[PDB]
Amino acid sequence: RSFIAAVIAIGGMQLLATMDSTVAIVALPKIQNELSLSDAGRSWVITAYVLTFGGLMLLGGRLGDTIGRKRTFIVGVALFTISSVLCAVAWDEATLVIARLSQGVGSAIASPTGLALVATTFRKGPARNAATAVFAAMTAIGSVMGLVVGGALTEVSWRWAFLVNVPIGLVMIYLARTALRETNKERMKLDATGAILATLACTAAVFAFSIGPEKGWMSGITIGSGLVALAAAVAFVIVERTAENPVVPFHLFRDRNRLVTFSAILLAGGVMFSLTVCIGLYVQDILGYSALRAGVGFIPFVIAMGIGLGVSSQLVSRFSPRVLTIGGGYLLFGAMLYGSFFMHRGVPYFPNLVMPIVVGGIGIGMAVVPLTLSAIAGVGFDQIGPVSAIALMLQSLGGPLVLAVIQAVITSRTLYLGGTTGPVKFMNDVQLAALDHAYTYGLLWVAGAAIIVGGMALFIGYTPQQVAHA
Amino acid sequence: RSFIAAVIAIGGMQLLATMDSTVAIVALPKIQNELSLSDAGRSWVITAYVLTFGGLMLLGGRLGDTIGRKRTFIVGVALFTISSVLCAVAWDEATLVIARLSQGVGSAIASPTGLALVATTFRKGPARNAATAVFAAMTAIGSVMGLVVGGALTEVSWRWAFLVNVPIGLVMIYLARTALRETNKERMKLDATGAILATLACTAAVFAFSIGPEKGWMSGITIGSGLVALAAAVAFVIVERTAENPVVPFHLFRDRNRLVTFSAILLAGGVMFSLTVCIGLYVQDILGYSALRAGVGFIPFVIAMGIGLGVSSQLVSRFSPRVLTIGGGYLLFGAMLYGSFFMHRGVPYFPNLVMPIVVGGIGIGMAVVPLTLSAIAGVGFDQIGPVSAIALMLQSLGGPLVLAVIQAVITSRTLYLGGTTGPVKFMNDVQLAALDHAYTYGLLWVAGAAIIVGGMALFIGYTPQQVAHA
Ligand SMILES: CC/C=C/CC/C=C\C=C\CCC/C=C/CCC(=O)OC[C@@H](COP(=O)(O)OC[C@H](O)CO)OC(=O)/C=C/CCCCC/C=C/CC/C=C/CC
Ligand SMILES: CC/C=C/CC/C=C\C=C\CCC/C=C/CCC(=O)OC[C@@H](COP(=O)(O)OC[C@H](O)CO)OC(=O)/C=C/CCCCC/C=C/CC/C=C/CC
Ligand SMILES: CC/C=C/CC/C=C\C=C\CCC/C=C/CCC(=O)OC[C@H](COP(=O)(O)OC[C@@H](O)CO)OC(=O)/C=C/CCCCC/C=C/CC/C=C/CC
């Protein structure tokens, strides 16, 4: 039981954080009808979590080296679980935003430690390959369970949806206490000066990006915050040259395979994030399956993805990460080509929608394990901290960049085919049909980004005896 | 002057075959007004040329070994030039059909000899690379010059357009005679039984594939035509086992890098053929440029292609055919993504149409040179005949296969967007707008087929020392 209890506990924060993201999105309209927070406050509950989760990520990367990775994992999760209760008792806009702020602080501390715990706890070999599959398995499980939970326990109250994290979170705190052993190495000094500038630079950059669309791109306060971030970013690099125990080891990023792998995960995250957002919007708006029925209909995705991850964990020892990334990428290509020809409003569920989801899930799951193992290959125990923190930063940061281009193509083609921009419930059956054909057309431009991802994967060059097979 | 006159004469049949093909398509509607051979006779003049050109392709490969490579190239061109004069004096469908039949026979003899002449005449190294670029360069020149000649000298008569091949064709016979030296090796016995079975199989398959859409797929004679095609093909393989100097050396095609490099050009030719048909139809119908203006507007394509071919000849000695094929093909991906977003009816010619054509021309030209050098590498002199005939047979055969799939996607999406199937001259500006967006949508599926070509190009693995640099 020691093995299964360890992989479940380590990947728990991936289950918790991803599930919370979808439930908060689903319950947003009912928050309007109760708190009466207006349209300006609608975005302030979402970006409040993102403000601290991305701002504190680098600080939480080096936090486990000076205190302890296991202690960091329990503390970070506990603050996440406590914050959910404070989120479900919110009475005023100030109460909710502060509750969402502290969830990001709790997530930023524990999330990078989860990836680092895979490399240190499990030795290189079949154990790490099985641990990588489980770590990637429950990220998609939380997303699907988020739709089912958020689509079922929402008509009685949005407050009960946030209270489902507590039973799940308490188990992972219990499992991590009795299934993970505290390692014994001497603690190292924290880069306090480096962490101060790194935190205030990423938080300012996210604040400027969020306030842009609201107050205008050239309001005067947005540029002022960007100037502060650019001044901090310049100073942060300067100190790191002669700073012991760097937050970011720039010397570790050379012309080696590390840049190619870290550039691939930056773009591969954007392809996956944009694919999830567009498919969920297409099913809920064009097909009208709502939250509950869409989540149950995505159950085959988890089973197919679980099949792909389990198979890829066996083949990684024999095949290089280059061929498994491409091999699973071609199964993705056939899914969205078949998912473009056979999608309009009113099609049956089994002949038309089941196959693209199942086949695409196997291809996606096949290429996740080789990419994860190569990003934590040949780094060591003193430097696995910041490397894991950077890997989760680039994976999440690439999402909005790619989706911004994809959503621009969707909007442009809607106008050309004949349509309007606005809420969907106010669109007759010619502007609605144009939006149907716009999303399907934009599914092919997602494949255009996937080709770019695969082209960068040609330069990995890792052999199977380095990433695995030890 | 010896070098430039030699290579021009070698690639001369490529100029003739492509340019005559385009002119025959352009002047087809005027043949209706004069010969009055009805709809059923419209497709016979196109079918008649293809029936013998593809039917006698395999015979022409081994015909140069038993007779002479230079002598075969002269008679093949001479019969082509002669048949153009008889074509332009046609006075009934029977006279025009016979002339088109004889034009294919002359082309089937000289076309495979042109590619074989590249390998034997020029020694492997810098001389072959420069000769390869000019060989591919004049294939694209003939296509554009066919539009201008057939779009300008056709308002006076369709008979004058057919007589423009004689001044050019007579020059090619002169340059070949003066600038090509007759090699001195002993002639070999021709496989009489194999040549008879090879000829009958291809014409029967072409005849069945042509009468199918006309008379019905299960009409009764198409299955009979398919019966002799299978009977000839089955006996051809049986008798080829013990046949001296085989027509098709099956033993040469093993699990080595030759089957991969022959499957790539099978589908690369289909992508390039479907790109020309779709673009030419889109420009003439949606934009209404007619034939003369379309030919002038595609002049920058040839200039851009010439730059791509010239650069690729220098780089092929330092880079393998794998990287140049994948690297050159990414420029094609960028052009067709740009050409899908910024191309509708009524756009200016400069910013929206010239840029994708110029960039796409460079990308195509960079990938053509490595593919043909790999297709004639390391075979010898006693087997360069059949191998070059197969390379031209598969390149032409892949065209209709890929285009049939693309045209099915275009027709399916036209109906969904709102529109009908029929002549463009009866549209109510609403079905015309839908046909505009259907062609643009189908441009991305051509990119999907080009991705498959890239995938097979990863298995080439030819060293630049083997295909060049000697
Ligand atoms: C090593 C460093 C880091 C490693 C750490 C990383 C470790 C592993 C991570 C891997 C990737 C992400 C995990 C997966 C998360 C989400 C996936 C999921 O399970 O979530 C369900 C849904 C989301 O939706 P959701 O966002 O909730 O929607 C709500 C709206 O926003 C408003 O309510 O996604 C999907 O089903 C995905 C479907 C793609 C399959 C391919 C189909 C192609 C053809 C389909 C045609 C249909 C027509 C579409 C026409 C466009
Ligand atoms: C070694 C083995 C063998 C080696 C032996 C062979 C050695 C090398 C041979 C390679 C392949 C063929 C060469 C090229 C031949 C044709 C190309 C050409 O020069 O011909 C011009 C025109 C043809 O037209 P044509 O067919 O005459 O038209 C008539 C109508 O059918 C009815 O009159 O094509 C083009 O301009 C091609 C443009 C492609 C550039 C990239 C475009 C991307 C953006 C597109 C946006 C536009 C919107 C499209 C929306 C869909
Ligand atoms: C095969 C097993 C099972 C099959 C089983 C078959 C059944 C179905 C299919 C299964 C999966 C397919 C396998 C995909 C394999 C691909 C990986 C690969 O085999 O790769 C080849 C080559 C080797 O490399 P090399 O190390 O020399 O050789 C060592 C090896 O031969 C062994 O040791 O990779 C390259 O170099 C790539 C060359 C292209 C140059 C890049 C330029 C274009 C991109 C520009 C910028 C990027 C994008 C930016 C913005 C767009």
Numbering used by the authors:
A (entry chain B), B (entry chain A): 49 to 518
Paper text:
We determined the structures of the antiparallel dimer EfpAEM to 2.7 Å resolution and the parallel dimer to 3.2 Å resolution. The parallel dimer uses the same interstitial residues that interdigitate between identical residues in the sequence in a side-by-side manner, resulting in a twofold symmetric assembly in which the symmetry axis is perpendicular to the membrane plane. In our case we also found and determined the structure of a parallel dimer. The dimer interface is based on the same residues as in the antiparallel dimer with the interacting side chains being left to right in the parallel dimer, versus top to bottom as in Supplementary Fig. 5. In both the parallel and antiparallel dimers resolved by cryo-EM, the density of the two fatty acids chains of PG1 are similar and lie within the protein domain of EfpAEM. PG2 densities differed between the parallel and antiparallel dimers. In contrast, in the parallel dimer, the two fatty acid chains of two individual PG2 molecules of the antiparallel dimer are replaced by a single phospholipid molecule. One acyl chain is inserted in through the sides of each monomer leaving the head group in between monomers. In the parallel dimer, PG3 fatty acyl chains were only weakly defined and were not interpreted.
EfpA is an essential transporter in Mtb and categorized as a member of the QacA (quaternary ammonium compound A) transporter family. EfpA TM helices organize in a typical MFS transporter fold where two bundles formed by 6 helices (TM1‐TM6 and TM9‐TM14) are arranged with an internal twofold pseudo symmetry. Although EfpA has been suggested to play a role in Mtb drug resistance, its essentiality in axenic culture implies that antibiotic efflux is a secondary role, and that the primary function of EfpA is the transport of a yet-uncharacterized biomolecule across the Mtb plasma membrane.
